[PDB]
Structure formats: C-alpha cells, structure tokens
Write an enzyme that holds these catalytic residues in place. Structure first.
Site, PDB file in Angstrom:
ATOM      1  N   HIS A  61      38.775  33.278  38.331  1.00  0.00           N
ATOM      2  CA  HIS A  61      39.189  31.888  38.201  1.00  0.00           C
ATOM      3  C   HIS A  61      40.688  31.736  38.367  1.00  0.00           C
ATOM      4  CE1 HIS A  61      40.187  32.993  33.989  1.00  0.00           C
ATOM      5  NE2 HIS A  61      41.023  31.973  34.053  1.00  0.00           N
TER       6      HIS A  61
ATOM      7  N   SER B  80      45.802  35.005  31.284  1.00  0.00           N
ATOM      8  CA  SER B  80      44.573  35.290  32.006  1.00  0.00           C
ATOM      9  C   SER B  80      44.799  36.268  33.152  1.00  0.00           C
ATOM     10  CB  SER B  80      43.973  33.986  32.529  1.00  0.00           C
ATOM     11  OG  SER B  80      42.771  34.231  33.220  1.00  0.00           O
TER      12      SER B  80
ATOM     13  N   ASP C  85      33.511  37.178  36.368  1.00  0.00           N
ATOM     14  CA  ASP C  85      34.738  36.410  36.511  1.00  0.00           C
ATOM     15  C   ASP C  85      35.943  37.315  36.769  1.00  0.00           C
ATOM     16  OD1 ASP C  85      36.448  34.069  36.360  1.00  0.00           O
ATOM     17  OD2 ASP C  85      37.003  34.727  34.342  1.00  0.00           O
TER      18      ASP C  85
END
Lengths: 202, 195, 185
Positions: free
Chosen positions: B41, B146, B71
């Site tokens: 993402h 992230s 992911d």
C-alpha cells in the site's frame, strides 16, 4: 531478585526538576499556563520554557520537597525558546546532574521529567529517537533531540535525562499535525547550557 | 558508568532502512543486490518510486512485484557501490515481551527510532486485525513508519511495520502491527524467483 | 546473543490475566486478574456494572460465565468467580516489595478486543493511585500491571481523558485487601 528499573536516574534528577506556573490577572489571579524547569545550580538559576513564562504577572516555581518560590525572569532566548529564572533559596537547593563530556547517542534510554496537566511530577521513559538541526545547513550544530518519551502539556521546560540521571536536554513542545504519538523534542543540554550562561549576563 | 542504550541495534539496522517517495512510506534493504521490501500500500499506484538511504544516496526503484495477500511489495535498485543490509537471524524465535525498536520516516521528519516491546505474536480466530500472523507492538508508529523495520536489541529484523491503528470511538495508544520477518523472507524470494 | 526481553515477566503473570466481557451483545469490555487458584478474579466495578451476563475468557481460550461475588464502591473494584475444571494460574504477588518510580512495568489487558496484549512503561508516579506510561486503552481496565519479575504492582483502571501515556492503577495492596474481604463471605 530485583526489578528492572530506571530508579537510579529518577533519584538523582527528579528533585532538581521544578513545577512552573504562569499566573496572570483575570483583581483575581489565575494560571495561564504551567510547565517545568530544571534547577541548574545552587545559586537559584532555573531553565524553563519561554512560552511557559511569557506575559507572566507572577511566576511561581514549586520544588518537589514542598518549597514554593516566587521567581524572577532573568531573560529568555527565541531561537531555542528557552527562558532562565532566578529564585532566592537559603536552605540549600537540589541540582540537576550534568556531564559535560557526555555525547547523547540515538537509542540511549531517556527519561522525561515534568508536570503534565498539573497532575504532579511524573516520569515517562523512551529513547533518543533522533538528533538534528532546525535552521540553515543540515550539517550545522545539532539543535534538537527527538524522543518518544511521552510528552504532554506541562512537560515544557522539563528535563530529559539518561539512565544515570545526566542531563540530555530541556523538553520543549510536542508534535501535532492524524494524532501523532511518541514524537517529542528537547534542546540538547550543551546548548541549553551555553544559552543560560549567556542570558545570565545582562 | 555507561548509559543504558539500544544504540547498537540502531547502528546495525538503521543504515539498511530507507525513505520511500514517489513522483512517502519506508523500506528495508533486504540484501546486497538492491532488493528492498516495503508495504504494497506504500507503493500502490505510485509513479516513479524514489528511495533515499540514510547515507544520502538516492536511487530510482522499480516495482519487482507486490503481494496482496500480505500487503508487501519488493523493489529493486541498481547501485554501483556497496549496500547496507538489514540483519536477519532466521534461527531467532520472537518472544512476547522482547524489547523492540521501530525504524521509519514519520511525517517525513527524517529517520527516527521508537522503542516498545512485542505486545503479541499472533492471534487465534476472528479479530480486529483481520489476520492471524500479525506481530503487535507498542513502539510508536506513525504515518511514514509503514514499510520500515521492527528490530530487537541486537538489530535483528523482527518484522516489517505496517499501517497505523488510528480508530471506532477514540484514538488508540501503543497499538501498532508488523508483518513477521519469516513471512517477508518467503514473499520476497517468491516475487523474486517469479520474475 | 540473547535479545533484551521482559518475557520472563510475561510468562509469570500473563496466564493469570483474563478478558472480561459485559453482555445479549457487548455493552463494554475489560480485563481481570485471577487472585487465587479456586477461580477468584479481580476487575473494576465499572466494567461489569449492570451486566445481564459476565463473560470471562482465559488467555488459553477457555470461556467461563462469571459470578459477581462483590465489589467496593470506594476503590471501584469488583470480584468475580468462575468454576474451572482444575486449578487456575494466579498472578504473582510479593507484599514485601516497595514500588519505585522508574521501575519497568508491563500492562496486561484486552485493548479494543484485539486479544491479550502486553505494553510496557515505567512507574511514572506513586502519589493511593499509581501512574504509569505503559500504554493503556479502552479494554485495559481491571487488568494487571506487573514489574519485570511478574510481581503485581496494581490493577489498571481508567485512563486520562488528547493526553499521551498517562494511565493509573490501584495498588496491589488494595486489591489483595479487597479480595480477602470478599472471599471470606
């Protein structure tokens, strides 16, 4: 056996960190804002946050041992947002441990000492997250320290110490720009110091 | 006396953690050849993926492939010099309570290190995470962390940090998740030997 | 080498911490701590207050319905009872240990129903209410707050109403006193 603890640092520094209050006319006087300060030496010199004592009718310094002083603003510094107070103690003052030869490293366990929401002196721990410079030329002299030790309104002006109670910096304001966590700043101790000495020359 | 510190884990792992941007998440330089892991993402529908190392070097990276079931995405950069790699001990068993450090680029403030511990190793049955193998930590995670790394006090990769939890009533504190390193090592090789 | 860890603390205490559910449906959740083998659990009063049914769930998966045996308005502590088909794991307690500010301490509870989670902080203050910065969230109430040796330092309560890292706990001495008072009846 004995518990893991950062109590040796707390015992050496906690006593030198005072609770600061900014009281102003409302008649009827009240607290505009409150922060913290670090008694630098037995002459009564304290280092706090400039925004904490700005536009103050009365500055109240309260030690952990119960002693309450009315302080005098000796002068503040804009670039770093530091301010220096002065109290008249006669019974002996507890001072903050300092190690001028020490250089802070990223990862060092660090403890923040302040008065969050006036709940009374609290100690939070984290590590030195990063070290940088705000201003011209990123390679210039280190200007700030970043830590994930929880910071809240009331910590401003407080102390950042390592596990030996040595001073690492003067906690400043936190970060806010969703709802960030573990991001707080402090002014390196070597800088906080040089500014105080300057200010104490008027 | 010596000050208590995790600086060792830092000196060992931070050089291998990069800043991801396009033309801004984080990434981990898994191995010499230039293979960089990150969250799918983080790079989803991005244009030119730029990758900045902590030593100031900057490279353009190509998406060698991502994996929706985890992911995760893998990037490749062609560097001439030598590259820093994340320490990885495949014989290490992550335990609940192990001191852990998260390395990332929060709000693009520059690489930062936050410390907490391993809150959980996995979960049994339905749960807010939607998964079973998630590693839960209370080490401060923010927008920008992230794709970064989750390492222990020896600098060993524990997992790849993922999306922050910012909730269904009030703002949660000390709740972050990471993808097991054992799972990222699998998904890397697969997306690699798969073109 | 070996990673710096507080797993020893987890292994010792975590088994004894339970997940408390207030049902029907779910009106609210929290945590509790098994004070003794027979199945006595301490939790907070507000968590099981006005419950059609009190569900307790061990970290091992077993789920038991609970009996509200009693509570204490003064400290906001309630005592639950479950019948396990065997001895249950108890929270370590050391009445001879004095809590110090700066002591590493772990928070064990059920945050947002994520499942049992362990967060870590230190004893931020001891001013009959203990203060810690070990991340506390909704669902942590009634949970355990232990030091690096798994010894109980306190029952976490409700947090600080945004403030970061401000959480309080009711001293283990109080929980111990309240548990004996209610078991004796």
């Amino acid at each position: 056996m004995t518990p893991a603890s950062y109590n040796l640092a707390v015992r050496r520094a906690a006593p030198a960190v005072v609770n600061v209050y900014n009281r102003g006319l409302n008649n009827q006087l009240e607290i505009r804002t409150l922060g913290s300060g670090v008694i630098m030496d037995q002459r009564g010199y304290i280092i706090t946050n400039k925004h904490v004592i700005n536009d103050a009718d009365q500055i109240i310094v309260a030690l952990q041992d119960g002693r309450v002083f009315e302080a005098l603003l000796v002068g503040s510094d804009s670039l770093t947002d530091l301010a220096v107070l002065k109290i008249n103690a006669t019974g002996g003052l507890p001072t903050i441990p300092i190690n001028a030869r020490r250089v802070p490293h990223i990862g060092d366990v660090v403890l923040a000492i302040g008065n969050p929401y006036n709940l009374g002196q609290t100690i939070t721990q984290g590590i030195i997250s990063a070290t940088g410079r705000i201003g011209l030329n990123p390679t210039g002299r280190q200007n700030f320290l970043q830590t994930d030790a929880s910071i809240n309104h009331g910590n401003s002006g407080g102390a950042l110490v390592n596990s030996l109670g040595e001073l690492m910096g003067i906690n400043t304001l936190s970060f806010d720009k969703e709802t960030p966590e573990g991001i707080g700043f402090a002014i390196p101790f070597q800088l906080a110091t040089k500014i105080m000495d300057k200010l104490i020359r008027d």
